[PDB]
Amino acid sequence: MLNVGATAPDFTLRDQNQQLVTLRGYRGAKNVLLVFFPLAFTGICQGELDQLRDHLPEFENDDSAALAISVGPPPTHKIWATQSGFTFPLLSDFWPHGAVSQAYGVFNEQAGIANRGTFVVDRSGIIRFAEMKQPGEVRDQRLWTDALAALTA
Amino acid sequence: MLNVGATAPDFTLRDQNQQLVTLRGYRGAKNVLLVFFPLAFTGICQGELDQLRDHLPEFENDDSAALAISVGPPPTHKIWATQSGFTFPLLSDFWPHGAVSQAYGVFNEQAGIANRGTFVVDRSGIIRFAEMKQPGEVRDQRLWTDALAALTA
């Protein structure tokens, strides 16, 4: 897993509507919270993304953007997003399979899915926060807002 | 949609506990926040109401009261409220179907559901804040608290 201080691998991925989303596009404009998750329609990250949806104003505003990423293709993310109320971007690290996840050091080579890793990328494209919690343990979202809050005022 | 300056159409609707709630009952006592919503058990509605829930003291206090309104019947709002931890009123604009929603000009004729209409009704019963977003769009709740604050101090 890339650690704090590393330049964040740039990427171009399709969101749930088949639109292209590039990390570079936020450079100089917004800090970016990257939430990698293993698989759509599973218990743990459903709860995790539900928290994100419920606190969206803290993640998607004038100073911050939030991007969820997993290896699933757009149709999968669209169905789940629509059913779950995910109005933020769910990006497909689908083909190449897990290419971005591997570059961030959060890919499970054995199962073929991304681990629950989280990073905050600043306006310079530098990783300023990196998190990877133990299995079965949900991530601390108050932590993400604190991290984001430190990169503003 | 009804706009600021209009008298808010009065109503008497059943809440999730089958108790009668009438809008006029708040006149001369509290400003009322009306949050219409398309349907219970849907994603974006869940997110909006979880946000309201998470910040309830800001909408339900000495100066203000909040009522969420939808076409669903009492049983439907009761289960959703209990599972979601919603302690505020959820009113049934059920039969006649969406009559109140139609009166406020926020009823979606093709789908048979209220759109995301929000209103602030002051102590005289006049609409002081109005907005209507689509079922696929998300509302900015800061606008809600801001308008409620303007009728207080």
Swiss-Prot record, chains A, B:
The active site is at C45. Its EC number is 1.11.1.29. Keywords: Antioxidant, Oxidoreductase, Peroxidase, Redox-active center. It catalyses: [mycoredoxin]-L-dithiol + a hydroperoxide = [mycoredoxin]-L-disulfide + an alcohol + H2O. CDD domains: PRX_AhpE_like. InterPro entries: AhpC/TSA, Peroxiredoxin_AhpC-typ, Thioredoxin-like_sf, Thioredoxin_domain, Tpx_Peroxidase_subfamily. Gene3D superfamilies: Glutaredoxin (3.40.30.10). GO terms for molecular function: peroxidase activity. Residues 2-153 form the Thioredoxin domain. It is an enzyme of class 1 (oxidoreductase). Thiol-specific peroxidase that catalyzes the reduction of hydrogen peroxide and organic hydroperoxides to water and alcohols, respectively. Plays a role in cell protection against oxidative stress by detoxifying peroxides. May represent an important antioxidant defense against cytotoxic peroxides, especially peroxynitrite, which can be formed by activated macrophages during infection. The active site is a conserved redox-active cysteine residue, the peroxidatic cysteine (C(P)), which makes the nucleophilic attack on the peroxide substrate. The peroxide oxidizes the C(P)-SH to cysteine sulfenic acid (C(P)-SOH), which then reacts with another cysteine residue, the resolving cysteine (C(R)), to form a disulfide bridge. The disulfide is subsequently reduced by an appropriate electron donor to complete the catalytic cycle. In this 1-Cys peroxiredoxin, no C(R) is present and C(P) instead forms a disulfide with a cysteine from another protein or with a small thiol molecule. Belongs to the peroxiredoxin family. AhpE subfamily. Homodimer. Forms both dimers and octamers; a tightly-associated dimer and a ring-like octamer. This is Alkyl hydroperoxide reductase E. It comes from Mycobacterium tuberculosis (strain CDC 1551 / Oshkosh). The gene is ahpE.
